[PDB]
Amino acid sequence: QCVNLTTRTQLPPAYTNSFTRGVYYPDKVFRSSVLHSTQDLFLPFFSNVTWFHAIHKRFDNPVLPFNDGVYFASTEKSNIIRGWIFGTTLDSKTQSLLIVNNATNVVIKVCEFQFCNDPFLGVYYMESEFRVYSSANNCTFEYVSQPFLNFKNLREFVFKNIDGYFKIYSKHTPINLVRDLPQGFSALEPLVDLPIGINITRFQTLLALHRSGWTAGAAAYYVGYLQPRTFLLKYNENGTITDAVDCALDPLSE
Amino acid sequence: TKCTLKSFTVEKGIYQTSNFRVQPTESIVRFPNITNLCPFGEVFNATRFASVYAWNRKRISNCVADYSVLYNSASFSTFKCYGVSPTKLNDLCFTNVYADSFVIRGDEVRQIAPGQTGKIADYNYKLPDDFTGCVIAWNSNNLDSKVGGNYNYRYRLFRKSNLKPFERDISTEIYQAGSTPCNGVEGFNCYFPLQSYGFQPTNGVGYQPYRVVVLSFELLHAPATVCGPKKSTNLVKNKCVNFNFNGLTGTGVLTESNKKFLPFQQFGRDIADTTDAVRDPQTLEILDITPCSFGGV
Amino acid sequence: ASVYAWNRKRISNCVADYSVLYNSASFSTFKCYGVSPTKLNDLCFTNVYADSFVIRGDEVRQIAPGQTGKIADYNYKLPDDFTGCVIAWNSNNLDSKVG
Amino acid sequence: FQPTNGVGYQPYRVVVLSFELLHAPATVCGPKKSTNLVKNKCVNFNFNG
Amino acid sequence: SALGKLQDVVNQNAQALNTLVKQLSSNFGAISSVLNDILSRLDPPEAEV
Amino acid sequence: SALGKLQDVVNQNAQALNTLVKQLSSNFGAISSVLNDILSRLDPPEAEV
Amino acid sequence: SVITPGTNTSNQVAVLYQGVNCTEVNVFQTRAGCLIGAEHVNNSYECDIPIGAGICASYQSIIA
Amino acid sequence: EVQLVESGGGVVQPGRSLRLSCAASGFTFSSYAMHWVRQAPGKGLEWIGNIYHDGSTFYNPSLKSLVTISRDDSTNTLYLQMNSLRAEDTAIYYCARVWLYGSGYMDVWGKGTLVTVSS
Ligand SMILES: *[C@@H]1O[C@H](CO)[C@@H](O[C@@H]2O[C@H](CO)[C@@H](O)[C@H](O)[C@H]2NC(C)=O)[C@H](O)[C@H]1NC(C)=O
Ligand SMILES: *[C@@H]1O[C@H](CO)[C@@H](O)[C@H](O)[C@H]1NC(C)=O
Ligand SMILES: *[C@@H]1O[C@H](CO)[C@@H](O)[C@H](O)[C@H]1NC(C)=O
Ligand SMILES: *[C@@H]1O[C@H](CO)[C@@H](O)[C@H](O)[C@H]1NC(C)=O
Ligand SMILES: *[C@@H]1O[C@H](CO)[C@@H](O)[C@H](O)[C@H]1NC(C)=O
Ligand SMILES: *[C@@H]1O[C@H](CO)[C@@H](O)[C@H](O)[C@H]1NC(C)=O
Ligand SMILES: *[C@@H]1O[C@H](CO)[C@@H](O)[C@H](O)[C@H]1NC(C)=O
Ligand SMILES: *[C@@H]1O[C@H](CO)[C@@H](O)[C@H](O)[C@H]1NC(C)=O
């Protein structure tokens, strides 16, 4: 089952500043009270991060490139954002990755889904509407895990695809800022490593409708792109990354 | 002192002679208590193998791999390991083991090595320069040859550019010839990339079908899931021991620690990159590793 | 020439334009066994031996490494580690005679 | 060889090119596609090897 | 910055020690920078290299 | 030869710089002193050596 | 080369490209190279941060 | 001499099956591998399938279960069964022949057959 959403309002996507967000732990090694230089796929400091809204009538589910990696930020309240779609052609010709977080558990499946043009979940005012794919024939990887999840909640994720491994890094932050990204530093802990082994060039955000037509709950998300660069990370006495330096941002940090 | 100064008479003074180092007393091996065997029977003893252009990749994880049944088998004509010794394969714990299975003819088995050139290396299956793993190949004339000719195995004769390491090309696309496009029959007739092997049992050696399994490893980064048959020893505190934690070897005293490791975090590294703390499998505790007492005499 | 007395032409001290030969459409067979057709224009060799003869259409495959046939065993034999390219083309319009 | 014969009995002319890579100098080389010359810019030049 | 000459000597000595310790992390073209890994992974004919 | 002390320093510095440049023309046992010739004539496993 | 005061004082920096003309890269041409980010002044002070060829830099913005 | 002729083209409903035939005349059908290729109007050529003397059939990964290649060597013919026809399969089909003891040159080609699907 697929449903076209024809009540959207036309608006260009916005842009804003990354500040010093998007830093994740580069490896699984404990380091304490040290300054470590690492060269990896990182999000550049003060970069141009693309801003998408969900407000009522805005419902931003575009087709975005994946490139080398994706930083995904979410200023979320009332749980609209439910998952992501990764793939190349997003049809039954190629193999695609599904990550969903419904009311019970987090499900990761690697199958050849025949995806809808507008994949979505739904909340009735209980969840009783799910229209993401019409079929799933050849499934190789399944992984059921714990639930990962004024705007009250900040969700940071880093998605990387190296050597057939999909690294998802996550950080959950209590915030009370109304509209934009808060300015500060928070190192993203690694959440999960998935052995999917598939080609990914395009990705989709999955949202949830509110029914009482449809109504979009208030949410906002941000997409940034990772580039290969060097960071100087500071590890405190407790092994937590407390500050970072982008080695190629400006001559002072260089 | 006489031996150090190379003289039978030693003048008055202080002389640096050697470096005292306390030796370890016993070896403790700590490995996960996983007991599942790895499905090597489903890989080596499979009835059907895919072609070299569309080689089969099976990810082997979360099991105990008994490599001693591979080397001691006399079936394998070629057992060449790069970056690891086959005898030591039982003693090591790996991560991200990959089994790549395909069928190639006899004289192309030399091309399944890092740094080889040919049709298979460039356009079908490319190994990296820094490849660690094992290439295993054995004759399969009595299974993969038919009297009329076996036509199920095909190789990619030509590609526009060379393949990247561990890159699969299952894409079958019509390609051109030169100065005229492939806009129908009108132009220069269009070449096909995939060519089948001529497998007959009467063929001489070098043309016969050989089954190739390539084992690929990753050297100690994330927590290891594929470990050898080695058993786990008990843990001893505050004594100099030569330990082996998931393939990480070393000598030191294992002590209690106050380092608040995060759940993902397993080990710790100093400036020199030598391991300073480790998380033991089975019990998940965090043991600090302090080098055994040494100094100048 | 005939296949028992195939003409051997030695190519040396010259620049060889393999692009004209590869792009020629008269050739029904441009099959290489040790090199790549697209890298012929980049590489350099000491000398080239060109062996020219005429055979039957069914015996064209017999000029191959590891191939066993009457032409392979008694007329023209290639080594197992042969490098180079075999080019063959139909000549019904020229060689053939009604008698 | 007759014109009435089908494909397989028709005469085929075969030329076999074999390459030698001995210690002798490589007299036989591929064509040399010279491009245009650009001056006053930091370029990668390849002049006669 | 009154006592810069002594601090300069201390910093140079500490930095030389830090560089010497850091040089153990380099493999210098070998498969690994750790000797125990090489001794546990390879037979003595290639572990010697 | 009045100002030989300064001229010796200038000559030593220039000669050391010239020697450091001339060391680039030595192959040090390799097949060629040019990296591009090695990268174009050999595969990366032996060009690496 | 990066010319900066202490990070306790300021985060302003200047960039010296040694032996590079300013047309091949607050831009000033020195015999040492091209200095970007420092305002050249006609006054003479004591040398605080040495640039070279008689040029020195100081913080008061960064002046050369 | 060598000749490939095809049959089975026409204007048919979508979902109805088709059987395209490729008859070979002038050469022995053995020792050669047979190809089915299609080209759409305004689009380049797309390869469909391969069949050998053994009977091994290899299909394009892009389209699965739509076609079935069936070789016959008593009368030197090649058959394609097409099932579950979609609207996008309007194309000109070609029968191709490669030699098994050489590179994949497709040599001589069929004249082609036209398949138009409509509702
Ligand atoms: C929702 O809209 C999309 C895009 O308009 C529809 O996708 C197209 O559907 C037509 C109908 O046959 C096809 O001809 C196109 O090829 C489709 N395009 C793509 C890019 O898929 C989609 O069908 C609509 N959903 C429903 C349920 O009708
Ligand atoms: C971000 O990009 C948009 C267009 O892509 C541009 O108009 C805007 O100025 C950019 N913002 C920054 C801070 O570079
Ligand atoms: C991934 O897909 C894109 C387009 O879908 C393609 O260009 C690219 O080569 C693919 N990469 C791999 C490794 O398959
Ligand atoms: C959540 O998704 C899983 C997997 O599809 C399913 O088994 C489960 O019933 C779902 N829960 C709800 C409440 O929809
Ligand atoms: C993928 O699914 C299709 C249809 O379900 C099937 O025909 C095909 O064989 C499957 N692929 C594999 C590799 O099994
Ligand atoms: C480190 O942890 C201790 C308690 O374990 C805490 O008191 C201290 O503030 C922490 N350090 C920082 C910089 O927050
Ligand atoms: C394959 O079968 C033989 C038959 O006994 C057995 O000895 C061998 O161990 C098997 N191989 C594997 C990998 O299990
Ligand atoms: C085995 O190891 C797992 C972790 O891999 C641990 O959770 C479990 O308690 C261990 N069991 C025993 C009996 O040691």
Numbering used by the authors:
A (entry chain A): 14 to 69, 77 to 145, 153 to 176, 185 to 247, 257 to 298
B (entry chain C): 299 to 595
C (entry chain A): 348 to 446
D (entry chain A): 497 to 545
E (entry chain A), F (entry chain B): 943 to 991
G (entry chain A): 596 to 620, 641 to 675, 691 to 694
H (entry chain H): 1 to 119
Reproduce the article's own wording on this structure.
SARS-CoV-2 utilizes a trimeric spike glycoprotein for attachment to the host cell receptor angiotensin-converting enzyme 2 (ACE2) and for the subsequent cell entry step which involves the fusion of host cell and viral membranes. Given its crucial role in the viral replicative cycle, the spike protein represents an important therapeutic target and is a critical antigen in host immune responses. Given the rapidly changing mutational and antigenic landscape of the SARS-CoV-2 spike protein, a structural understanding of spike protein mutational effects and the discovery of broadly neutralizing epitopes is of importance.
Ab6 neutralized all variant spike pseudotyped viruses but exhibited 9–26-fold decreased potency for Epsilon, Kappa, and Delta and 4- and 3-fold lower potency for the BA.1 and BA. To uncover the structural basis for the attenuation of ab6 potency by the L452R mutation, we obtained the cryo-EM structure of the Epsilon spike bound to ab6. A global 3D reconstruction was obtained at 2.45 Å, in which ab6 bound both up and down RBDs, as seen in the WT-ab6 complex. Focused refinement enabled visualization of the ab6-Epsilon spike interface at 3 Å, revealing R452 to extend towards the ab6 scaffold. This orientation places the positively charged R452 sidechain in close proximity to a hydrophobic portion of ab6, centered around F58. Thus, the reduced potency observed for R452-containing spikes is likely a result of unfavorable charge and steric effects.
